[PDB]
Amino acid sequence: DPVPTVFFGDSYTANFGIAPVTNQDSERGWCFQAKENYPAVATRSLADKGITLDVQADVSCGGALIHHFWEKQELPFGAGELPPQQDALKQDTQLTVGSLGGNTLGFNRILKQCSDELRKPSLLPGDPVDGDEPAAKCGEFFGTGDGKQWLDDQFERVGAELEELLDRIGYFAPDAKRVLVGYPRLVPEDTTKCLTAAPGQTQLPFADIPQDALPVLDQIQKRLNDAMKKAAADGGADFVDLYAGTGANTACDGADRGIGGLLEDSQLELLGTKIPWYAHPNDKGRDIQAKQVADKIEEILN
């Protein structure tokens, strides 16, 4: 029995950094949606356990904010405007899975704030929150400064928009089981580990980000995780808590790492260049994602 499914989301579903990309040569090339993202791999796995997903659309795309679910996404450099992701839903859609949220909080703006290196031209969307405040001071800015209230404002828009995401799904695909996928843990409980470069790497997991800012960044990820859990519980959705189980598969777990480093090379080649991971899941991280999601779908379909 086919289970009509829609995959949606941001760079953590599109799996920015994994190549080859789908639609290489068309407008959606700028989505940086790998051919083998967690949705692709989860369908495979499930198929050989006998769960047959009839995938109707996989509209995840890098840089998607929560409201891109209901608004047009503008791709970089004039590629175009993509239709709202909600448009992929059908009345007969029975399963919807994706990760939306990090870009509404502006986890990218928090990384760029904490790093001068990230403040120079890159393929990571966003602007520092306080661009005059200095990179090196970022763990103060967010903990005691202006950043600290900025965060409570971002977190309030997040809570409101996730509820709205969940209600629009409910509205267009009334029979759909909703699966909100969480983000993998970026920084480990023991930050000392980030002080080493990963076997074979020359740059540190988080480049120039002050070591002191490292535990704040995790605090903020935890938070976003609790916001996503809540939103799902209150909205009738299921949640895949990737954060709780990637505690030893962070960006700082050397060779067991499931997050490529900030400046580490991804598999993405633009002219004759590798594009950095920018802290997105790597191959290992993508298999965890796949495994955990496939796990959860299986559970829910039984």
mmCIF file of N, CA, C and O in Angstrom, residues 20-33 35 79 270:
data_model
loop_
_atom_site.group_PDB
_atom_site.id
_atom_site.type_symbol
_atom_site.label_atom_id
_atom_site.label_comp_id
_atom_site.label_asym_id
_atom_site.label_seq_id
_atom_site.Cartn_x
_atom_site.Cartn_y
_atom_site.Cartn_z
ATOM 1 N N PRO A 20 25.665 14.257 -5.335
ATOM 2 C CA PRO A 20 25.039 15.220 -6.215
ATOM 3 C C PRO A 20 23.728 15.824 -5.749
ATOM 4 O O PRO A 20 22.933 15.226 -5.015
ATOM 5 N N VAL A 21 23.474 17.015 -6.231
ATOM 6 C CA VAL A 21 22.239 17.786 -5.977
ATOM 7 C C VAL A 21 21.142 17.402 -6.949
ATOM 8 O O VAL A 21 21.431 16.979 -8.090
ATOM 9 N N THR A 22 19.873 17.502 -6.603
ATOM 10 C CA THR A 22 18.746 17.220 -7.499
ATOM 11 C C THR A 22 18.534 18.544 -8.254
ATOM 12 O O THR A 22 18.942 19.598 -7.715
ATOM 13 N N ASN A 23 17.948 18.478 -9.441
ATOM 14 C CA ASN A 23 17.724 19.675 -10.281
ATOM 15 C C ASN A 23 18.955 20.559 -10.508
ATOM 16 O O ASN A 23 18.823 21.805 -10.597
ATOM 17 N N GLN A 24 20.165 20.047 -10.652
ATOM 18 C CA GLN A 24 21.458 20.708 -10.812
ATOM 19 C C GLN A 24 21.417 21.956 -11.697
ATOM 20 O O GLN A 24 22.010 22.992 -11.424
ATOM 21 N N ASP A 25 20.736 21.784 -12.782
ATOM 22 C CA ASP A 25 20.539 22.645 -13.925
ATOM 23 C C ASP A 25 19.227 23.367 -14.079
ATOM 24 O O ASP A 25 18.845 23.740 -15.208
ATOM 25 N N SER A 26 18.491 23.562 -13.022
ATOM 26 C CA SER A 26 17.189 24.266 -13.112
ATOM 27 C C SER A 26 17.129 25.217 -11.926
ATOM 28 O O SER A 26 18.128 25.191 -11.189
ATOM 29 N N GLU A 27 16.005 25.899 -11.802
ATOM 30 C CA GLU A 27 15.831 26.859 -10.706
ATOM 31 C C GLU A 27 16.140 26.308 -9.323
ATOM 32 O O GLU A 27 16.884 26.989 -8.574
ATOM 33 N N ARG A 28 15.638 25.134 -9.010
ATOM 34 C CA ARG A 28 15.797 24.469 -7.721
ATOM 35 C C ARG A 28 17.170 23.923 -7.387
ATOM 36 O O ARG A 28 17.326 23.245 -6.351
ATOM 37 N N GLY A 29 18.155 24.241 -8.195
ATOM 38 C CA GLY A 29 19.543 23.831 -7.965
ATOM 39 C C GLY A 29 20.044 24.597 -6.729
ATOM 40 O O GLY A 29 20.871 24.088 -5.956
ATOM 41 N N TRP A 30 19.516 25.806 -6.560
ATOM 42 C CA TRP A 30 19.799 26.723 -5.472
ATOM 43 C C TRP A 30 19.168 26.281 -4.161
ATOM 44 O O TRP A 30 19.350 27.015 -3.180
ATOM 45 N N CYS A 31 18.484 25.166 -4.140
ATOM 46 C CA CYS A 31 17.901 24.594 -2.940
ATOM 47 C C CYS A 31 18.963 23.722 -2.256
ATOM 48 O O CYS A 31 18.871 23.383 -1.071
ATOM 49 N N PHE A 32 19.935 23.312 -3.064
ATOM 50 C CA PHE A 32 21.038 22.440 -2.658
ATOM 51 C C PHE A 32 20.507 21.156 -2.013
ATOM 52 O O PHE A 32 21.063 20.648 -1.030
ATOM 53 N N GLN A 33 19.455 20.614 -2.608
ATOM 54 C CA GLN A 33 18.778 19.405 -2.158
ATOM 55 C C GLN A 33 19.511 18.197 -2.739
ATOM 56 O O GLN A 33 19.407 17.977 -3.948
ATOM 57 N N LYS A 35 20.350 14.501 -3.701
ATOM 58 C CA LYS A 35 19.698 13.368 -4.332
ATOM 59 C C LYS A 35 19.509 12.295 -3.249
ATOM 60 O O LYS A 35 18.469 11.578 -3.149
ATOM 61 N N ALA A 79 17.597 33.650 -9.046
ATOM 62 C CA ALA A 79 17.273 32.309 -9.573
ATOM 63 C C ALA A 79 15.781 32.361 -9.867
ATOM 64 O O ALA A 79 15.382 32.139 -11.013
ATOM 65 N N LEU A 270 31.598 24.182 -6.723
ATOM 66 C CA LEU A 270 30.999 25.197 -7.602
ATOM 67 C C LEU A 270 31.842 25.423 -8.840
ATOM 68 O O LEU A 270 31.353 24.863 -9.861
#
